[PDB]
Design a protein around this ligand. Structure first.
Ligand code: BLA
Length: 483
């Protein structure tokens, strides 16, 4: 019965809302096919009253439907299927699935004049051609963002990248003129709490037909079998958190639809479609996106590792240049401090320090004091050959490696505090009408929430950055020992 406030919202059970969106009806069955619960609108949408204890009957739901249901009813492992069928006055999409051991049948009115197979195929071809045309991982995102809008007619579609700390960044955008831009927006991991994030990962597509909707409750609330709520995780019609709904209306959005990009076990980022008026996307089309989601995820994965590959390649090429120079010139300092192949170019940094013997070369600033303090901190830890941190002198980020012990051969890279890369301003943008929860649920409030998180922090060191440092360290050890 608990109200969901700003304090609660992190722990909101959004998977068991026990209600569904109004653009469809829902019937929940148990293993034997016996009805356990239904949305309060089954009668109003489909001509009949589903009742707990009942079993579904032909042409109160039609034949092919039970035909489908029986197949999944007798199959081990998460059944999933859909049928198209006429029930009374209308034809329906009857998407059905089984999660836990409860079976779900979802009913959407089908208004499309097209054959489903071809509608599905047509859109799949169109939206994944965008995945064959681009080598830049960012062109991919940018282009499919522009294309998703062309296909769906959404007012605004955005592409979101998720950082290491699960903070988001709007990296692409295609929007109707009128609308303010959110390009370069940054938001915290708290604006998509655990359960919501778990769900985007498990579900390629989420659709919100109308944010201003009144939910259609499924009765009864609790599954008699367990005396605990129905887990609508894989339910297409599952209802929305009032918090998110308030957020979206603060923005002035009325319909959403998001396509996930999952790589590893991580939500790599999603495409979020917004509309200013309510909007619906037919089932077969959503399936076009679902399959797309899986392929795009695959290509983004490769494109990303193709990116790291090239980073490693030019790094070694520079380690080669470095090895070449060092042996022939015989001062390392000159080699390391080289403007372009220098260490400052090896790994993205705002500065670097080279330190062998008693001599100190600070390149791109005065870093001698910091390096001294960092080194003192490592006093307590004589065995550390590598040190790094984004919390901390005057530079937040530090990556230090040791290549000579006795003569204190050290290398440092430094990073300043992370800064909002792109920022809007210039003319006060319009007044958002703000709900009861407060300004926290506006983009402006989200950004501020993000600042408070990152400030005091430099950008984390790449998986890649550390790998390079490690290779460099090996190089110099080799050199110093060798000659
Ligand atoms: C304390 C919990 C929450 C706060 C605070 C909050 O702002 N939202 C909270 C719960 C949920 N967030 C959900 C998803 C979600 N998060 C955002 C935030 C942004 N997206 C942007 O593009 C920008 C700025 C450019 C921001 C600030 C959005 C838009 C969404 C909706 C996802 C979508 O549009 O597809 C979320 C999911 C709820 C659901 O739809 O089930 C919850 C519960």
């Amino acid at each position: 019965i608990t109200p969901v406030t700003l304090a609660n919202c992190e722990d909101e059970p959004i998977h068991v809302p026990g209600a569904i969106q109004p653009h469809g009806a829902l019937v929940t069955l148990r293993a034997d096919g016996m009805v356990l619960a239904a949305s309060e609108n089954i009668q109003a949408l489909l001509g009949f009253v589903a009742s707990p204890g009942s079993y579904l009957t032909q042409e109160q739901v039609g034949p092919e439907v039970l035909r489908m249901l029986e197949e999944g009813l007798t199959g081990n492992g998460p059944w999933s299927n859909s049928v198209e069928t006429r029930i009374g006055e209308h034809l329906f999409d009857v998407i059905g699935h089984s999660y836990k051991e409860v079976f779900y049948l979802e009913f959407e009115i089908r208004t499309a004049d097209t054959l489903s197979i071809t509608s599905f195929t047509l859109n799949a071809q169109r939206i994944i051609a965008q995945v064959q045309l681009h080598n830049d991982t960012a062109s991919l995102l940018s282009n499919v963002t522009d294309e998703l809008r062309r296909m769906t007619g959404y007012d605004r579609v955005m592409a979101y990248r998720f950082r290491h700390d699960d903070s988001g960044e709007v990296v692409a955008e295609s929007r109707r003129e009128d609308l303010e831009s959110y390009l370069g927006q940054r938001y915290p991991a708290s604006d998509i709490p655990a359960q919501a994030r778990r769900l985007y990962i498990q579900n390629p597509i989420r659709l919100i037909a109308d944010v201003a909707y009144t939910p259609m409750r499924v009765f009864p609330a609790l599954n008699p079998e367990t005396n605990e709520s129905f887990d609508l995780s894989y339910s297409v019609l599952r209802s929305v958190s009032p918090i998110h709904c308030e957020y979206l209306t603060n923005m002035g959005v009325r319909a959403s639809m998001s396509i996930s990009i999952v790589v590893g076990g991580k939500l790599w980022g999603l495409f979020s479609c917004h509309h200013m008026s309510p909007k619906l996307i037919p089932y077969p089309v959503r399936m076009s996106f679902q399959i797309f989601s899986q392929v795009c995820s695959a290509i983004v994965e490769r494109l990303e590792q193709g990116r790291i590959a090239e980073l490693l390649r030019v790094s070694t090429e520079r380690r080669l240049a470095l090895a070449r120079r060092a042996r022939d010139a015989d001062d390392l300092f000159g080699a390391l401090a080289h403007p372009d192949d220098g260490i400052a170019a090896l790994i993205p940094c705002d500065g670097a320090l080279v330190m062998l013997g008693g001599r100190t070369l600070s390149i791109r600033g005065d870093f001698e004091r910091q390096a001294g303090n960092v080194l003192q901190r490592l006093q307590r830890d004589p065995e550390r050959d590598i040190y790094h941190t984004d919390n901390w002198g005057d530079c937040c980020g530090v990556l230090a490696i040791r290549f000579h012990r006795q003569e204190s051969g050290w290398i440092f890279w430094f990073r300043h505090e992370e800064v909002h890369r792109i920022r809007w301003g210039g003319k006060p943008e319009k007044l958002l009408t703000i709900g009861p929860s407060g300004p926290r649920l506006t983009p402006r409030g989200s950004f501020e929430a993000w600042e408070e998180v990152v400030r005091g922090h430099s950008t984390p060191w790449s998986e890649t950055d550390l790998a390079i440092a490690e290779k460099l360290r090996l190089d110099l050890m080799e050199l110093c020992l060798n000659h």
